[PDB]
Amino acid sequence: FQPTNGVGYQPYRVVVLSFELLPATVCGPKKSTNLVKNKCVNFNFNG
């Protein structure tokens, strides 16, 4: 590879991520919210 490479011949980094499932160990971010008290609220605490 050279600095003056063409778009087709220019280098490209490639990464393939394969997910294997058959207890799952890597899960999603599982975003959260703020806590509010003293009101009729629909709550979800860790499932």
């Binding site: 058959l22 207890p23 799952a24």
Partner: protein
């Protein structure tokens, strides 16, 4: 899941499995997913 519960107690016996009551609290729950059928312990020895 490999579950390990633990407890530690102070005693002053010489040779017995002491009586009494003590509930073991959970220590860890490791997501291993292996097939376990046999196990062994590992001790320490003194040398000089």
């Amino acid at each position: 899941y490999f579950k390990i519960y633990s407890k530690h107690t102070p005693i002053n016996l010489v040779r017995d499995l002491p009586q009494g009551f003590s509930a073991l609290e959970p220590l860890v729950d490791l997501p291993i997913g292996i097939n376990i059928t046999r196990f062994q312990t590992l001790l320490a020895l003194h040398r000089s």
